[PDB]
RNA sequence: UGAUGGGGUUAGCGCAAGCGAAGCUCUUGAUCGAAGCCCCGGUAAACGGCGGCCGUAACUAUAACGGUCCUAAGGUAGCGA
């Protein structure tokens, strides 16, 4: 994790300061990725749908017995 | 090409003055007038040229997509330090 990059030649060294600076700073941002898409914010609308989806199959299992 | 009108000079009409035929001049030029030009299309293995801005998907990251502007058209196939 010695994370290296060669901020090569320029007409002002400080230019690559702000270059390598915004590079590492943003790198930390890009590597924020809190589980790549995970908040996860799992809605409740899809939960009732599948729940009622389990309901339809429930009553049909009133099939064969006795 | 040359219709006209306009200027100069001077028989005759007239004793100043003036007028002015006619001649000849100077000038104006109506009119005639083709291609080109304009309009019109076709033409890119003719010369050539072949975009912006901005938002958006289960926080993250990108944006298939969406909005709007602009252009004659908005770079496909393939390829790419």
Curated annotation (Swiss-Prot):
Region (Disordered): 33-66
Coiled-coil intervals, chain numbering: none
Compartments where located: Cytoplasm
Protein family (similarity comment): Belongs to the prokaryotic/mitochondrial release factor family.
Function: Rescues stalled ribosomes. Can hydrolyze peptidyl-tRNA on ribosomes stalled by both non-stop mRNAs and mRNAs that contain rare codon clusters or ribosomes stalled in the middle of mRNA. First identified as a complementary ribosome rescue system when the stalled ribosome cannot be rescued by the SsrA(tmRNA)-SmpB quality control system or the alternative ribosome-rescue factor A (arfA).
Free-text domain note: The unstructured C-terminal region is required for ribosome binding and peptidyl-tRNA hydrolase activity. The C-terminal tail functions as a sensor to discriminate between stalled and actively translating ribosomes by binding in the mRNA entry channel downstream of the A site between the head and shoulder of the 30S subunit. This allows the N-terminal globular domain to sample different conformations, so that its conserved GGQ motif is optimally positioned in the peptidyltransferase center (PTC) to catalyze the hydrolysis of peptidyl-tRNA.
Subunit structure: Associated with 70S ribosomes and polysomes.
Name of the featured protein: Peptidyl-tRNA hydrolase ArfB
Species for this entry: Escherichia coli (strain K12)
Gene (UniProt): arfB
